[PDB]
PDB file of C-alpha atoms in Angstrom:
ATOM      1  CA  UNK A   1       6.401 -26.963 -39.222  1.00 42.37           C
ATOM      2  CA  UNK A   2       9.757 -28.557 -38.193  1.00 41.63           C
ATOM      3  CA  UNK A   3      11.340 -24.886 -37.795  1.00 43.50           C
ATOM      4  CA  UNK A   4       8.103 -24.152 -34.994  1.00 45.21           C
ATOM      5  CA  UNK A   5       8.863 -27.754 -32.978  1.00 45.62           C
ATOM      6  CA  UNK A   6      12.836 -26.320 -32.913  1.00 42.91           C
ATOM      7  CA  UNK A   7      11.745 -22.903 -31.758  1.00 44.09           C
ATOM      8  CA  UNK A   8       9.494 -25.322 -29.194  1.00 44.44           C
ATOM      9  CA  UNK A   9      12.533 -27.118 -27.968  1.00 42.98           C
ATOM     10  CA  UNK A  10      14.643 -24.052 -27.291  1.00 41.27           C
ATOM     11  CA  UNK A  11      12.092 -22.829 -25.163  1.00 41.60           C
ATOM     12  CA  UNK A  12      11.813 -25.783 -23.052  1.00 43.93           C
ATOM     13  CA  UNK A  13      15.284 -25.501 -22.519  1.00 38.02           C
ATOM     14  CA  UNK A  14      14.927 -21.790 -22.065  1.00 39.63           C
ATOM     15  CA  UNK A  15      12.543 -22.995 -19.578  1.00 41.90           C
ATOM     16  CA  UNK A  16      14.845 -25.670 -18.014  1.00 44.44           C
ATOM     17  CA  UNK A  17      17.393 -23.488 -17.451  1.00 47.12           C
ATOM     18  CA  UNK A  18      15.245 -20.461 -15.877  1.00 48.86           C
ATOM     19  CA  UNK A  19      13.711 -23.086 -13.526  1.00 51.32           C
ATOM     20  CA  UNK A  20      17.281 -24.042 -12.229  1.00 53.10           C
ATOM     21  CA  UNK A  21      17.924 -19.906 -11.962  1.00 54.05           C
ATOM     22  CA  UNK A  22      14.793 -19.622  -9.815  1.00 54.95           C
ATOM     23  CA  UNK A  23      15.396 -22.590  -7.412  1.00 57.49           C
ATOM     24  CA  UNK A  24      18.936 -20.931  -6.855  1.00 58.74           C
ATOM     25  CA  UNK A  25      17.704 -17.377  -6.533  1.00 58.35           C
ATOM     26  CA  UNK A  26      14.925 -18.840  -4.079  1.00 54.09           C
ATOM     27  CA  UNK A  27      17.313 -20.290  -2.273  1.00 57.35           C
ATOM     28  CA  UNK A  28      18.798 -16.760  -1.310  1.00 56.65           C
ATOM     29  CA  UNK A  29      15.726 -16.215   0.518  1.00 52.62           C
ATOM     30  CA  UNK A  30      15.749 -18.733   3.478  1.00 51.08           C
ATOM     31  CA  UNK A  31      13.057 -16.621   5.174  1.00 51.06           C
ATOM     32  CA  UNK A  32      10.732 -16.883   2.540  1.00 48.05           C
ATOM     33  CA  UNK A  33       9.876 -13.451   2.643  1.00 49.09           C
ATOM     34  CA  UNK A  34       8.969 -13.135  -1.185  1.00 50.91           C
ATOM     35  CA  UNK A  35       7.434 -16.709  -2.052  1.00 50.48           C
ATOM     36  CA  UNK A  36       4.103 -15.561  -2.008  1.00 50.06           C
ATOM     37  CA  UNK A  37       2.172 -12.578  -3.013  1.00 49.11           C
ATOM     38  CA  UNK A  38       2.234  -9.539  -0.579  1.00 50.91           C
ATOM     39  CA  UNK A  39      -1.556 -10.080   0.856  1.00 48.94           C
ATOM     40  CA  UNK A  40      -4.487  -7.757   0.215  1.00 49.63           C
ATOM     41  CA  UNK A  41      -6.334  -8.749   3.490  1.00 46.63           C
ATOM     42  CA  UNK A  42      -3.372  -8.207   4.881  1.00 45.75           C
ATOM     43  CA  UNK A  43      -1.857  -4.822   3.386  1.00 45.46           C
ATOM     44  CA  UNK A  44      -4.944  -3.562   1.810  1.00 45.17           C
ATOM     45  CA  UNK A  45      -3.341  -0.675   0.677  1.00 44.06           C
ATOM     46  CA  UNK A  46      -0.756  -2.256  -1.613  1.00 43.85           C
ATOM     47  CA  UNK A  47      -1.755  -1.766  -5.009  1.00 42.88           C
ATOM     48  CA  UNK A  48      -1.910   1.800  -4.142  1.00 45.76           C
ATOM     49  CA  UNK A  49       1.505   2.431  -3.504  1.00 47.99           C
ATOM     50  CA  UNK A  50       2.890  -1.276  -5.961  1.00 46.08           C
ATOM     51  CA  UNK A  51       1.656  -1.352  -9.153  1.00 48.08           C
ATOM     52  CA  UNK A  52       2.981  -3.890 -10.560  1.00 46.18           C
ATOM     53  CA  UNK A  53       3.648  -6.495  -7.182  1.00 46.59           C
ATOM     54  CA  UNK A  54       5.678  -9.558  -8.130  1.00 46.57           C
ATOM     55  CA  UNK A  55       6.737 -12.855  -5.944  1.00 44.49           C
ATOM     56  CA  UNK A  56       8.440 -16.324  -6.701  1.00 44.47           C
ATOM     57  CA  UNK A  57       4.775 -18.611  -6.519  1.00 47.41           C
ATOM     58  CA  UNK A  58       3.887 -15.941  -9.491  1.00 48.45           C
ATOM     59  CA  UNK A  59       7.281 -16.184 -11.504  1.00 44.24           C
ATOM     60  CA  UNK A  60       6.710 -19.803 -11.368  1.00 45.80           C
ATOM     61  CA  UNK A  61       3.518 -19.610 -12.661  1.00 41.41           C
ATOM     62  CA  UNK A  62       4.924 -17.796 -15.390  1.00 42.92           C
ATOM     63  CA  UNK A  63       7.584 -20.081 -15.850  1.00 44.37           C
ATOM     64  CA  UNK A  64       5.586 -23.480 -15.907  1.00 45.92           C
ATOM     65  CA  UNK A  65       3.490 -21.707 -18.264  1.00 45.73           C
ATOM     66  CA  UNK A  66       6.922 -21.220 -20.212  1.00 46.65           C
ATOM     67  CA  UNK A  67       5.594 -17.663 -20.506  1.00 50.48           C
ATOM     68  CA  UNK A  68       9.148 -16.100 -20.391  1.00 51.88           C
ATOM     69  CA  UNK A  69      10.843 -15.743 -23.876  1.00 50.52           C
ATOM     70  CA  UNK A  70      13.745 -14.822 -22.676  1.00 55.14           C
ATOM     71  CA  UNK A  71      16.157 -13.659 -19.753  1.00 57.58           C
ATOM     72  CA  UNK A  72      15.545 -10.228 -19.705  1.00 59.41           C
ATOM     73  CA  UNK A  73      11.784 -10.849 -19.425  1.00 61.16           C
ATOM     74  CA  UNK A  74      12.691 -13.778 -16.398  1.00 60.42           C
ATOM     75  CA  UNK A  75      15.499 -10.608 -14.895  1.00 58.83           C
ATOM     76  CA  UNK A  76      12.305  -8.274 -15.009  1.00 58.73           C
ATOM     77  CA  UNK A  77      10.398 -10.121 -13.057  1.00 55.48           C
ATOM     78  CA  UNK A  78      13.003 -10.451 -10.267  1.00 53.10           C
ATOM     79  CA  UNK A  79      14.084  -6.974 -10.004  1.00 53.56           C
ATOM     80  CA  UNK A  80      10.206  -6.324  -9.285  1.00 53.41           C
ATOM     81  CA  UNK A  81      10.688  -8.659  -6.535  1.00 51.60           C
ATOM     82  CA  UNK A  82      13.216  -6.400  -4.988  1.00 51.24           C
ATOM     83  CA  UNK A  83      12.336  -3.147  -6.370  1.00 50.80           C
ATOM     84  CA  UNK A  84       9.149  -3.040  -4.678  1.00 47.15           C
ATOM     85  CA  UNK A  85       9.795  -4.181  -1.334  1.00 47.19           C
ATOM     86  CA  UNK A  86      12.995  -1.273  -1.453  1.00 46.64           C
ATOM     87  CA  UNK A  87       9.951   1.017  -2.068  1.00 51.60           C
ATOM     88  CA  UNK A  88       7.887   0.186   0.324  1.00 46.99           C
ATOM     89  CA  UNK A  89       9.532  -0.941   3.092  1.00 47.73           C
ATOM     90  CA  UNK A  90      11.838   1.507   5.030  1.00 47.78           C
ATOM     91  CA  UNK A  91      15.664   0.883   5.357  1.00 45.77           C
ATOM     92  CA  UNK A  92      15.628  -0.418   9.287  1.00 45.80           C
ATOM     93  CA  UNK A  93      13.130  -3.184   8.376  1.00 42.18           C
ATOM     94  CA  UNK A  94      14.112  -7.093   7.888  1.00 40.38           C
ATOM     95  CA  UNK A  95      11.973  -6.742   4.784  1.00 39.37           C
ATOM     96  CA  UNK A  96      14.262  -3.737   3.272  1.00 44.43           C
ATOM     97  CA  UNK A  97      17.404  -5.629   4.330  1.00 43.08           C
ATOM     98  CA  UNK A  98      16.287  -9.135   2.448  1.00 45.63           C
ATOM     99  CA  UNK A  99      15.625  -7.983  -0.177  1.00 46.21           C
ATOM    100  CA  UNK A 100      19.340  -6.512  -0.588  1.00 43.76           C
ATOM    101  CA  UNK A 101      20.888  -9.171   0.852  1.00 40.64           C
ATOM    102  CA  UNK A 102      18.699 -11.040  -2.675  1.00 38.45           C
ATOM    103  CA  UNK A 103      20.077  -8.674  -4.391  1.00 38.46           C
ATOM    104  CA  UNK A 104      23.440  -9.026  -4.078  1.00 32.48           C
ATOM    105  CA  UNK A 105      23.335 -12.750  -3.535  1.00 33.06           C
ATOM    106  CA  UNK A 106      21.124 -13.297  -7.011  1.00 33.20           C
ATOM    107  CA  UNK A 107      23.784 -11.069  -9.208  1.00 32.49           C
ATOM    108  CA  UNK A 108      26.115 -13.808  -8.847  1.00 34.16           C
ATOM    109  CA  UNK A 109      23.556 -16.453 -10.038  1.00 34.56           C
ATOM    110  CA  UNK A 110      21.826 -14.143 -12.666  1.00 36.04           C
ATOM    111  CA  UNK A 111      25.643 -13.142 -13.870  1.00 40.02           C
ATOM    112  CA  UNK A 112      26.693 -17.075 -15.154  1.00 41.51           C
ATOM    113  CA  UNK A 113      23.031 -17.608 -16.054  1.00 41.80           C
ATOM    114  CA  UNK A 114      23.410 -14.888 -18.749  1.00 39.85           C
ATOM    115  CA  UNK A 115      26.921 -16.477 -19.852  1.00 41.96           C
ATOM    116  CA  UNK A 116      25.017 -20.111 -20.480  1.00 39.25           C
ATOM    117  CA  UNK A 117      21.973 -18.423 -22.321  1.00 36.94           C
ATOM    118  CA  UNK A 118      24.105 -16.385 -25.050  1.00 40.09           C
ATOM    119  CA  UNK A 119      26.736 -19.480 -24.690  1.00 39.97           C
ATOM    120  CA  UNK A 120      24.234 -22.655 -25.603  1.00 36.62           C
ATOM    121  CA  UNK A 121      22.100 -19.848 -27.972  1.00 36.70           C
TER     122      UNK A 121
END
């Protein structure tokens, strides 16, 4: 139908638009400390303490996929990112402290990102 190819569209702009919100967001990460999965070989005890362990090479899976039907499903995702490494990584650690200095840096991003998505519909 012609109403399924419009709902089509607005997802690849969806799409276009969270793509531009990730490169930003990854951006606030010049260490790359969450661009790839957290390694089982290397933390084998992970899953036991994260269930649900997130990164940005898997969010752009998603996204490339266009698997996210919105923002708050895209703002999900992210918030794993941090919440997780808050969890298991103690306050002292350069791991703890990226991932707040993400935090705070992202809000900004994720803040005029929310504007544009209710703004262009």
């Amino acid at each position: 139908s012609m109403e399924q190819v419009a709902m089509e569209l607005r997802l690849t702009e969806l799409t276009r638009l969270l793509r531009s919100v990730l490169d930003q967001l990854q951006d606030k990460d010049p260490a790359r400390i969450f661009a790839q999965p957290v390694s089982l070989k290397e933390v084998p005890d992970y899953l036991d303490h994260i269930k649900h362990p997130m990164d940005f090479a898997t969010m752009r899976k998603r996204l490339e996929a266009q698997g996210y039907k919105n923002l708050h499903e895209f703002e999900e995702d992210f918030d794993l990112i941090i919440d997780n490494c808050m969890k298991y990584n103690a306050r002292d650690t350069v791991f703890y402290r990226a991932a707040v200095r993400l935090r705070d840096q992202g809000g900004v991003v994720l803040r005029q990102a929310r504007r544009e998505v209710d703004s262009i519909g």
